[PDB]
Design an enzyme around this catalytic site. Structure first.
Site, PDB file in Angstrom:
ATOM      1  N   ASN A 120      33.815 -53.924  86.676  1.00 55.18           N
ATOM      2  CA  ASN A 120      35.053 -54.660  86.396  1.00 55.18           C
ATOM      3  C   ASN A 120      36.163 -54.567  87.450  1.00 55.18           C
ATOM      4  O   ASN A 120      37.084 -55.393  87.404  1.00 55.18           O
ATOM      5  CB  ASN A 120      35.651 -54.228  85.014  1.00 55.18           C
TER       6      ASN A 120
ATOM      7  N   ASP B 238      29.050 -49.646  86.451  1.00 56.83           N
ATOM      8  CA  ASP B 238      30.264 -48.912  86.128  1.00 56.83           C
ATOM      9  C   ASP B 238      30.336 -48.527  84.617  1.00 56.83           C
ATOM     10  O   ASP B 238      29.614 -49.071  83.787  1.00 56.83           O
ATOM     11  CB  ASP B 238      31.496 -49.729  86.575  1.00 56.83           C
TER      12      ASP B 238
ATOM     13  N   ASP C  98      33.852 -47.354  82.754  1.00 59.29           N
ATOM     14  CA  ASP C  98      35.135 -47.629  82.105  1.00 59.29           C
ATOM     15  C   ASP C  98      35.599 -49.048  82.307  1.00 59.29           C
ATOM     16  O   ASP C  98      35.780 -49.493  83.452  1.00 59.29           O
ATOM     17  CB  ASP C  98      36.194 -46.616  82.520  1.00 59.29           C
TER      18      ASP C  98
END
Length: 180
Positions: free
Chosen positions: A141, A30, A32
């Protein structure tokens, strides 16, 4: 036949694995709050500034790099088929990846177009990648991204600005050991 029919759609997110990648686990990473944190609020210590045009108007995006991201990306690029996979707009994420990935580490970059809206969330459906699922890992996240595939996910904490963070450095021996 007269004039060329536009290109017929791929059935998988990724192309077939290339030569240099045979025998390598596929690691979906990922962007962001995983590798970086971006805001539109100006800060003096940004790592990158990226101008993004939305609806004809330019937004300056301020990007901070999570600690150890360079070393982490470098080593992942040596060991795995690395895929950047974000629910973010490519107009934003792509130029960010250009600045962050200075070393051809990412085999592929998948953005909003590759995510599916499911019950409030944008899901990264790993069964769509065209890879052996026992040979895919996700570094992300947001558990909502991997709702269909939580067995493939190493827990990653959301990162905003904390310079004492070491999760990407700690990820290195974990990934080395499972490279074996």
């Amino acid at each position: 036949q007269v004039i060329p029919i536009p290109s017929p759609p791929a059935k998988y997110l990724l192309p077939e694995v290339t030569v240099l990648d045979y025998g390598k686990k596929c690691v979906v990473i990922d962007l962001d709050e995983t590798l970086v944190h971006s805001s539109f609020k100006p800060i003096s210590n940004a790592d990158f500034i990226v101008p993004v045009e939305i609806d004809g108007t330019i937004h300056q995006v301020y990007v901070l790099k999570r600690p150890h991201v360079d070393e982490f990306l470098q080593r992942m690029g040596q060991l795995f088929e690395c895929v950047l996979f974000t629910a973010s707009l490519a107009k934003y994420a792509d130029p960010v990846a250009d600045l962050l990935d200075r070393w051809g580490v990412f085999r592929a970059r998948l953005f909003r177009e590759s995510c599916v809206f499911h019950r409030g969330n944008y899901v990264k459906d790993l069964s769509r990648l065209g890879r052996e699922l026992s040979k895919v890992i996700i570094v992300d996240n947001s558990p909502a991204s991997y709702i269909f595939h939580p067995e493939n996910a190493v827990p990653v904490q959301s990162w905003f600005d904390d310079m004492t963070d070491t999760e990407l450095l700690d990820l290195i021996p974990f990934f080395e050991g499972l490279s074996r």
